[PDB]
Design a binder for this molecule. Structure first.
Ligand SMILES: CC1=CC[C@@]2(C)CC[C@@](O)(C(C)C)[C@@H]2[C@@H](OC(=O)c2ccc(O)cc2)C1
Length: 264
């Protein structure tokens, strides 16, 4: 029961996702690997995942992290974040509604939503039965707990996975997050707001036309609630990373650009 405009809208988003989301991570290469009240808070900020690399020959490398030193993981994390940020940026540039915005609003929207779209893409490779993010030959496993789900990002991934979303519903979440009219520095707030409203209406219509089961009652509102939580997680995590960056630099040039770090 979608209109022609709504079907075309989903087609372009799915087209952009297919072109820019390397679900096997085959082109993620050459990445680095692990070899006073601020440092206190940064110690609280720092804290748990094992890393597995499966070679093409069949060999396997595993890394288990240390206690307390806590910075051995940041270069790899920066490289993964940078790789995912590049895919998110390519995703936005293909979308016609995005590249018709002025370049200053494109930058403002990408600065505000890059993290959120990365986590949404990571949820599609999350395995809730094994607690692992399967990124091709890379795997990030949660180490051995109802106390673990207290962590808001982990709780997000478990709750979003439980909703059993389609590929089309994920890319519409990505569009709704991307076209947030209230990111800092957005000028065409009225245009972005009307674009966001139409992406949300398309999602609402898609769910009503394709999910009649009682388990999917209120699904649209559950998804919208997840996006609000993801934005709150985004804000807390950005302040976490900026405190760590202040104590121990790690941000790549691309992450610096997205964080507004000038280099002086
Ligand atoms: C750059 C990273 C690489 C490994 C991944 C992508 C594996 C999955 C991950 O998103 C997961 C710890 C949520 C993690 C990333 O974790 C986060 O981005 C994160 C973790 C906890 C939070 O409270 C917020 C963000 C870290």
């Amino acid at each position: 029961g979608l209109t022609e405009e709504q079907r075309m809208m989903i087609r372009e988003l799915m087209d952009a996702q297919m072109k820019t989301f390397d679900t096997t991570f085959s082109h993620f290469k050459n990445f680095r690997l692990p070899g006073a009240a601020k440092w206190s808070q940064v110690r609280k900020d720092l804290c748990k995942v094992s890393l597995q690399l499966r070679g093409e020959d069949g060999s396997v490398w595993n890394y288990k992290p240390p206690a307390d030193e806590i910075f051995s993981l940041l270069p790899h994390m920066a490289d993964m974040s940078t790789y995912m940020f590049k895919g998110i940026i390519s995703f936005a540039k293909v979308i016609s509604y995005f590249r018709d915005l002025p370049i200053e609003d494109q930058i403002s929207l990408l600065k505000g939503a890059a993290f959120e779209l990365c986590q949404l893409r990571f949820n599609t490779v999350f395995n809730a039965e094994t607690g692992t993010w399967e990124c091709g030959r890379l795997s990030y496993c949660l180490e051995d707990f109802q106390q673990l789900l207290l962590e808001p990002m982990l709780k997000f991934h478990y709750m979003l996975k439980k909703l059993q979303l389609h590929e089309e519903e994920y890319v519409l979440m990505q569009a709704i997050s991307l076209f947030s009219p209230d990111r800092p520095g957005v000028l065409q707030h009225r245009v972005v707001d009307q674009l966001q409203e139409q992406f949300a209406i398309t999602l609402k219509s898609y769910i009503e036309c394709n999910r009649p089961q009682p388990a999917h009652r209120f699904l649209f509102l559950k998804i919208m609630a997840m996006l609000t939580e993801l934005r709150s997680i985004n804000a807390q995590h950005t302040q976490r990373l900026l405190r760590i960056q202040d104590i121990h630099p790690f941000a790549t040039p691309l992450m610096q650009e997205l964080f507004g770090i000038t280099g002086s």
